[PDB]
From a paper:
Photosynthetic reaction centers are integral membrane complexes responsible for the extremely efficient conversion of light energy into the chemical energy of separated charges. The crystal structure of the reaction center (RC) of the purple nonsulfur bacterium Cereibacter (C.) sphaeroides shows that this complex consists of three subunits and ten cofactors. Cofactors are represented by four bacteriochlorophylls (BChl), two bacteriopheophytins (BPeo), two quinones, one carotenoid molecule, and a non-heme iron atom and are arranged in two membrane-spanning branches, A and B. Only one, A branch, is active in photosynthetic electron transfer. Two BChls, PA and PB, are combined into a dimer P that serves as a primary electron donor.
We have combined I(L177)H and F(M197)H mutations in C. sphaeroides RC to increase the stability of its structure and thereby increase the probability of obtaining the crystal structure of this complex with higher resolution. The crystal structure of the double mutant reaction center was obtained with a resolution of 2.6 Å and an estimated maximal coordinate error of 0.31 Å. The structure shows that the water is located at a distance of 2.7 Å from the central Mg2+ atom of BB, which is typical for the BChl axial ligands. This water is also 3.1 Å close to the imidazole group of His-L177, which is within the typical range for H-bond formation. According to the electron density map, imidazole forms a covalent bond with the methyl carbon of PA with a high degree of probability. In both complexes, the imidazole group of His-M197 is located within the H-bond distance from the C2-acetyl carbonyl group of BChl PB. Taking into account the coordinate error, it suggests that no H-bond forms between these groups in RC I(L177)H + F(M197)H. The absence of this H-bond is consistent with some shortening of the distance between water-C and the imidazole group of His-M197 (2.7 Å), compared with the structure of RC F(M197)H (3.1 Å). We assume that this can explain why the value of Em P/P+ in double mutant RC is ~20 mV lower than the sum of changes in the mid-point potentials caused by each of the two mutations.
Numbering used by the authors:
A (entry chain L): 1 to 281
B (entry chain M): 1 to 302
C (entry chain H): 11 to 249
Amino acid sequence: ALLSFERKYRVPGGTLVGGNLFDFWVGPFYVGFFGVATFFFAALGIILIAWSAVLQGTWNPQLISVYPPALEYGLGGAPLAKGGLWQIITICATGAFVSWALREVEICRKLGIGYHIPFAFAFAILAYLTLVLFRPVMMGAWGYAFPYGIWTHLDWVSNTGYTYGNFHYNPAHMIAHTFFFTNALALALHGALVLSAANPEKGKEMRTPDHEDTFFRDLVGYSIGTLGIHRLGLLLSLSAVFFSALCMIITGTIWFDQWVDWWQWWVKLPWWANIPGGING
Amino acid sequence: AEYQNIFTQVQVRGPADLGMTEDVNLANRSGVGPFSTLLGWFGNAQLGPIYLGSLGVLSLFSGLMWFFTIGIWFWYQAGWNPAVFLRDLFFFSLEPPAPEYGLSFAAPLKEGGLWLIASFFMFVAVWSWWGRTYLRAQALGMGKHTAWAFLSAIWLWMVLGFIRPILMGSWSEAVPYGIFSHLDWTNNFSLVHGNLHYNPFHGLSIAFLYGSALLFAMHGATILAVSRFGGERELEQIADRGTAAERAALFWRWTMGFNATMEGIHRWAIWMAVLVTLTGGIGILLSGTVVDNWYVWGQNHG
Amino acid sequence: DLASLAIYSFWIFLAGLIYYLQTENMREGYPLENEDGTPAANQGPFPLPKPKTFILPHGRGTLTVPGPESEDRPIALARTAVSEGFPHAPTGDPMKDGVGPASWVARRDLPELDGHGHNKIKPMKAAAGFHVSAGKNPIGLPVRGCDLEIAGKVVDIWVDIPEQMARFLEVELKDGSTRLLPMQMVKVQSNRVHVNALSSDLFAGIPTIKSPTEVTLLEEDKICGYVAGGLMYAAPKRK
Ligand code: BCL
Ligand code: BCL
Ligand SMILES: C/C=C1/c2cc3[nH]c4c(c3C)C(=O)[C@H](C(=O)OC)c4c3nc(cc4[nH]c(cc(n2)[C@@H]1C)c(C(C)=O)c4C)[C@@H](C)[C@@H]3CCC(=O)OC/C=C(\C)CCC[C@H](C)CCC[C@H](C)CCCC(C)C
Ligand SMILES: C/C=C1/c2cc3[nH]c4c(c3C)C(=O)[C@H](C(=O)OC)c4c3nc(cc4[nH]c(cc(n2)[C@@H]1C)c(C(C)=O)c4C)[C@@H](C)[C@@H]3CCC(=O)OC/C=C(\C)CCC[C@H](C)CCC[C@H](C)CCCC(C)C
Ligand SMILES: COC(C)(C)C(=O)C/C=C(\C)CC/C=C(\C)CC/C=C(\C)CCCC/C(C)=C/CC[C@H](C)CC/C=C(\C)CCC=C(C)C
Ligand SMILES: CCCCCCCCCCCC[N+](C)(C)[O-]
Ligand SMILES: CCCCCCCCCCCC[N+](C)(C)[O-]
Ligand SMILES: CCCCCCCCCCCC[N+](C)(C)[O-]
Ligand SMILES: CCCCCCCCCCCC[N+](C)(C)[O-]
Ligand SMILES: CCCCCCCCCCCC[N+](C)(C)[O-]
Ligand SMILES: CCCCCCCCCCCC[N+](C)(C)[O-]
Ligand SMILES: [Cl-]
Ligand SMILES: [Fe+3]
Ligand SMILES: [K+]
Ligand SMILES: [K+]
């Protein structure tokens, strides 16, 4: 089926591969070549996960886990039952994500809009590839990557972090955390601002962006504007993920001690290292 | 290549915009500040005006009182030596009363009496500021969504510093005012309760937190992608849908099989974000009051 | 156990909320339709919400959604297949007909008003006190199309007065008439403005506006639609 206004936009064209061959929909879903790619990769990966489940011996979402090859295997293959499945599933997953983004590009071209959405998605994809590919390879083993299971990958976050003490002290992770929390704050405000203007007091008229600017200036003395708030939400979000990937790309590679000790470079600065008093004197 | 609308190419300025008046007491509105051309490359260049009624000055005053009360204690921890004050800036901490003093206000000032003082100023400043978010919307005839969302963040903060200390019987449970010290508080809170990763409300908080970065990435990218049809003029696209709103909806429908409206997306947005601190506050509130170990609880309840 | 009760309750509340949010997002484009315009059999598992009504300011009326839904325009497309789900070929010139990436919506043929009832968007010449304040001022620059030929010259900027931003460049063509180009679709360079969406020969076909000092929502959608459609539709013949 189609929305009221949809048919005028369902024209040929936009594809990057295959010409008219996969230029069609399935219900609401656009296909394209990269829809087929996504389906193949995703279906393969899911099948392998269900297979890796019988080798483990459980069909329970909260127990199915697919661990990478152990550190003994370095950066080479491993028997399927012992981390080859994880490796090929990782290839499927990279395959499906990259396909999904390229499928979004084709939708972008058919609709005459900018490419901002798959570009933004590519930041998430690179965070994933940091954990499963870039950092493992820089560290010499696939075993440093996280397992694919609901609770076991949480255990991996905890064990990886505590390997460096309290992980809060990773300074890139400190910046990332700030962008995540700022982003949520911006999201709550933006959503509440537009809705407070579109849904004013009972019986009143629908307010204007002018009211939206006025409201925030009244409140904080500034208003970023309706174009700016969308620039902002995108920038906070992608920066959060960038500094996420950055905080882990540097951990276990250029820095591998307790992150709390990294901060001693500040306190042991010559002009104040040895003054008495304070917490470190 | 194509222009991406991330940064303005040509700024234009006109007379300083003093804003809608509606029912606002204009006597309490300042005059406009300067114009930041720097800001103008990303958002608005105009600073000010700001409204500052009595509730306004109250909030602002107790906020700095909270802040100076901490910084006073930080100087004394530095023995008034400016060089150590900077050197140890992230290590100073204004700690709450020890468990001995319970919920009382009897503790000496250098043993949590000062914490309670700064906390009082914080309490006053936040709650008055909350009233400001309601009142400034009322004066303009707008909905109360902003104050309602703000309440959700206030929820967690209230739980961390007030409701949960009270339910646990002592101020010692509350968060200390300090950079590194409250990070440590966070880590030790998790260890003491058997790993918050097993708190189901903590997991939900993360899903909404991650989700907010997902949704605002999606949303912000979508509006930029259709800003070549005026997409960011959202209120008028709500009142009279344009090709911008239709291409936006259809991108997502074609991608994931369903889509939003120009208004509805903002309801997804406000809820994604406010559920972060809503589930968050619940999960903290339950910790040590009802559940002492989230691993243990997880063994019996799922 | 209280925590078990709280989390079970929350999952129920979260399902009601998602249901609520999904229905709220069906106030446009629903009911679903077949490609021929009739109601589709399968509408999904979510019902239409009870209508709501927005009170527009400045006597502009109201909007009630969901409501009866019509494109309120002819659509020059035809099926390319004998079953559902394939593309629909333009029966004419797709940029002239306003289909595909060249599509426009029959928005109200009035201009958008600010909070004081005045037109949101004015050419800068008619905007008291408005001037270029940073970046290269485009007024006077030649405008170059994607075929690398000059199609015109910038003669003003059309500015959003309440938000104080540039929204269109007004470009004058060889014949002395002007067009509006969306600001978001030009690249202001030091010696020119570059428009990659249109070749020089398609500039004359940009929809024109009826009054030289305002632009209506309907006119903006035709201009924006047309220019954006050039990305797919100019690319063959020129680049
Ligand atoms: C991001 C930094 C860390 C990490 C740290 C944490 C922590 C800490 C927590 C989670 C939590 C979750 N994480 Mg994790 N997580 C990582 C990487 C991933 C990846 C990935 C491929 O890169 C995926 C798919 C997930 C998925 C998940 C969900 C099971 C859950 C809620 C996420 C959410 O709402 O996100 C925002 C996104 C949305 C709202 C959109 C919808 C996303 C849906 C829910 C994802 C479903 C995944 C599905 C179960 C996977 C199998 C797919 C099928 C095989 C096809 N994580 C890395 C290693 N993640 C939480 C939890 O409760 O876990 C038990 C939690 O507390
Ligand atoms: C070792 C650390 C522990 C752990 C311990 C805790 C503890 C303890 C808590 C969290 C909390 C949170 N954690 Mg955890 N957390 C861990 C692992 C993680 C991981 C991960 C990758 O594994 C992630 C992604 C998270 C993420 C999160 C968030 C979802 C959540 C906070 C919501 C929020 O925004 O609060 C921030 C928002 C607020 C505090 C509200 C602020 C509102 C007030 C009103 C603002 C006042 C401003 C003031 C006046 C100053 C003004 C200055 C201005 C400039 C003027 N945690 C591990 C297992 N985490 C919190 C939570 O909710 O848990 C359920 C919490 O308390
Ligand atoms: C960069 C800023 C943010 C950002 C941004 C954006 N995010 C986007 C877009 C943008 C802009 C899109 O355009 C796109 C989309 O359409 O949205 C609706 C997308 C999407 N973001 C998803 C998940 C998501 N985003 C997260 C984070 C952020 N996103 C950050 C914060 C997180 C976490 C953990 O935080 C999650 C879980 C999907 C919903 C969706 C891809 C679907 C897909 O690619 O389908 C194609 C693939 C499949 C249908 C399944 C493939 C199955 C494999 C082969 C088998 C499984 C392998 C796997 C490794 C197993 C893991 C188990 C688990 C327990 C560990
Ligand atoms: C999920 C829900 C999200 C969310 C939601 C919402 N959050 C809101 C609203 C909503 C909806 C509002 O409506 C309201 C507001 O109006 O927004 C513009 C507000 C707010 N959320 C603030 C901070 C915050 N939210 C956080 C969290 C989330 N919130 C989560 C993620 C976090 C953390 C830790 O994560 C923080 C730090 C303030 C900006 C503001 C309160 C001001 C106050 O109560 O002031 C009272 C204090 C004062 C008036 C003065 C205090 C003096 C200061 C220290 C200044 C000294 C300056 C010095 C001289 C110079 C240098 C500066 C240097 C120190 C830097
Ligand atoms: C240059 O130096 C000068 C002196 C000028 C300065 O002023 C420098 C200032 C500083 C250096 C200040 C630095 C400030 C910080 C480092 C702030 C750090 C604070 C945090 C990290 C906050 C963590 C979370 C805080 C929380 C959760 C607070 C909760 C507060 C409660 C909800 C309040 C409840 C009230 C109480 C308990 C008091 C009793 C209640 C009544 C109602 C009476
Ligand atoms: C992982 C994909 C990232 C999204 C990329 C966004 C910009 C892509 C531009 C595509 C143009 C392709 N081409 C060569 C046909 O023009
Ligand atoms: C969150 C960003 C806050 C920006 C604050 C801007 C302060 C308001 C400026 C008021 C100017 C008053 N004065 C003296 C110039 O007239
Ligand atoms: C309003 C958007 C709704 C987003 C849906 C969030 C999915 C939650 C999955 C996280 C699971 C958390 N838990 C309790 C199992 O730990
Ligand atoms: C949080 C769990 C993620 C589940 C993904 C849900 C995607 C639903 C897409 C539904 C659209 C398909 N259809 C035919 C029903 O329209
Ligand atoms: C969601 C409600 C949270 C609190 C419910 C009642 C518990 C109050 C605290 C009592 C128990 C605390 N303590 C110290 C005995 O563990
Ligand atoms: C965490 C996000 C939850 C997404 C919820 C899934 C919604 C899919 C149903 C959309 C209905 C599409 N339909 C049939 C009405 O067109
Ligand atoms: Cl809502
Ligand atoms: Fe928006
Ligand atoms: K315990
Ligand atoms: K002028």
